[PDB]
Amino acid sequence: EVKSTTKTQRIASHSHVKGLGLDESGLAKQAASGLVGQENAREACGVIVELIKSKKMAGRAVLLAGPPGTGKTALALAIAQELGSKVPFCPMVGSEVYSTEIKKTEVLMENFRRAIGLRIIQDVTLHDLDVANARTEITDKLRGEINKVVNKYIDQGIAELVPGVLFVDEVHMLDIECFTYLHRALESSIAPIVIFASNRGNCVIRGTEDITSPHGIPLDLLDRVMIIRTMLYTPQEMKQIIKIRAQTEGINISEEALNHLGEIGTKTTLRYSVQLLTPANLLAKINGKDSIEKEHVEEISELFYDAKSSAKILADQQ
């Protein structure tokens, strides 16, 4: 019957990402499958895709190391797209584990279950099955029931297990104990492909206080990790992505406005620029305008701020 637990608000910004856009050989195209530029990282993800498909990602994980708004998430989603469409993708933030009412293990177990799917053609994730049985609370006793049901369906041949992609952003935020929980899960046969993301260099491993390691990841886990670098976009790659977003969302934008919106990206991040589209559109609609023009973008960019510049304003006043 299915219900789909999927947190759509997350993947909403990447509605346009349909794959890696690589050619027959494995080289990236300037713009293809929704992706613009970032050719080298895309080509590297291509190898990761073939290694997952060739069962050669034996206990290995991935780290996309790059500045914010360089498509680390977009690439992790494209990896899931390339694994076959209807392969689970579970994006999460390292800080999610820190909750007062929910245990670290429970945040992680849910996100892992959200990243492993089933093909019955009905496409369900292990977490959708957990809520279906609950709609008291998702106990580990309820998990044991589903696991026995699922394992009998596989052996019979009615359903097949599809392990997806678990994307963990702000990796430096996970504590030593969480990494131990991931590493152990990463050793399993039916595990998803864990994809980390970092814009930081050497960090103290959370829970150690003294111990600095690359990206804040314990060396034991980091030895099993494959690093892919994502880089900053030029104002043109920027403009191209913004144009795709505008098109996707069904927003009309003048090339002049888009050029200015691209250079705002260079000054701030691509994420900031993309986010200005909605307010800029509403301002145009208020002004009784069909499309977003340069004035609208300029006005929105003046009224609203980016965390860096808004914090700077404060420090300067201080």
């Binding site: 909403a12 933030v93 909750s99 935020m173 509403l282 208020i286 002004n287 009224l303 404060l314 420090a315």
Partner: protein, 311 residues
């Protein structure tokens, strides 16, 4: 009498342009216009997965703008303003404090009653089972059509006070379909995120900052300060001389608007105690000598501690 009693809206025209002095709001033009664009987003239903940060020095109308937005959204729209430090309670969990803050900002139409009031009615921290019952109760009323869920405004001043544990709560909280529009305020630039060893603009995790519509309030001029004082006197029912307003605004600019406003009540009493009819300069001058501004309060303490260090 409330501090934002005069604020009745954002004082903007159909084109979202601020009117300088309208709906109880004076100056603070760009932030007011920006707050208006945010309202259009709430109304069009384009605020999902986003929040507002009013970044500015104290006494720049961050709370007043948040108040104007809530008034502008509807006469019944639930507005809840809390301090970041208020969640650190002896008799309450940080999250339970925040859960109450959220349920206070989510209304139920029948006379509109906040989800929190419904909890208190079927209670005396509130029981986990009690909320679970009300959540199922309101789900039935809504699907029936006898009740309407009206999400309001939750204002968190001193936002930099919150730790990751509470910051993560807000993320989970905003995932709900009946989540209110979260407006947060701070006067802090880059600070460490409480509960972490990491620094971030406004002490907010980068994942949450990347989702914000950051509005910045600029400090008031002598003209705007006088107009706020003039408005506040009217609300507190205080008659004052023009020469006195001139002095009180100067005090306000040199100290704080909070302190200048704090003086009104005291200055009027000094005046009332001698007939007066209206507050004169010597009334403002006397009340300034009597009660201290926090800057003066600490400077005197520094002078004291430093003198005992030298001798």
């Amino acid at each position: 009498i409330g501090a934002h009693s005069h604020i009745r809206g954002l004082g903007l025209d159909d084109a979202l342009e601020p009117r300088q002095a309208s709906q109880g709001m004076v100056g603070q033009l760009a932030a007011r216009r920006a707050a208006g664009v945010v309202l259009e987003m709430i109304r069009e239903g384009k605020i999902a997965g986003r929040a507002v940060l009013i970044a500015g020095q104290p006494g720049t109308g961050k709370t007043a703008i948040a108040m104007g937005m809530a008034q502008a959204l509807g006469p019944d729209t639930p507005f809840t303003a809390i301090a970041g430090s208020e969640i650190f309670s002896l008799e309450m969990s940080k999250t339970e404090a925040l859960t109450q803050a959220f349920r206070r900002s989510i209304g139920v139409r029948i006379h509109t009653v906040s989800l929190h009031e419904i909890d208190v009615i079927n209670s005396r921290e509130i029981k986990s089972e009690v909320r679970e019952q009300i959540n199922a109760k309101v789900a039935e009323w809504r699907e029936e059509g006898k009740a309407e869920i009206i999400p309001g405004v939750l204002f968190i001043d001193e936002v930099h006070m919150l730790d990751i544990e509470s910051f993560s709560f807000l993320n989970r909280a905003l995932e709900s379909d009946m989540a209110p529009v979260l407006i947060m305020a701070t006067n802090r630039g880059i600070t460490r995120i409480r509960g972490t060893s990491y620094q971030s603009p406004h002490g907010i995790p980068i994942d949450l900052l990347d989702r914000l519509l950051i509005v910045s309030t600029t400090p008031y001029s002598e003209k705007d300060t006088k107009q706020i004082l003039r408005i506040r006197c009217e609300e507190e029912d205080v008659e004052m001389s023009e020469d006195a307003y001139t002095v009180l605004t100067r005090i306000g600019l040199e100290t704080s608007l909070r302190y200048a406003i704090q003086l009104i009540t005291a200055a009027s009493l000094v005046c009332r105690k001698r007939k007066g009819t209206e507050v004169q300069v010597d009334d403002i001058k006397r009340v300034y000598s009597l009660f201290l501004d926090e800057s003066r309060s600490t400077q005197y303490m520094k002078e004291y501690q430093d003198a005992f260090l030298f001798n």
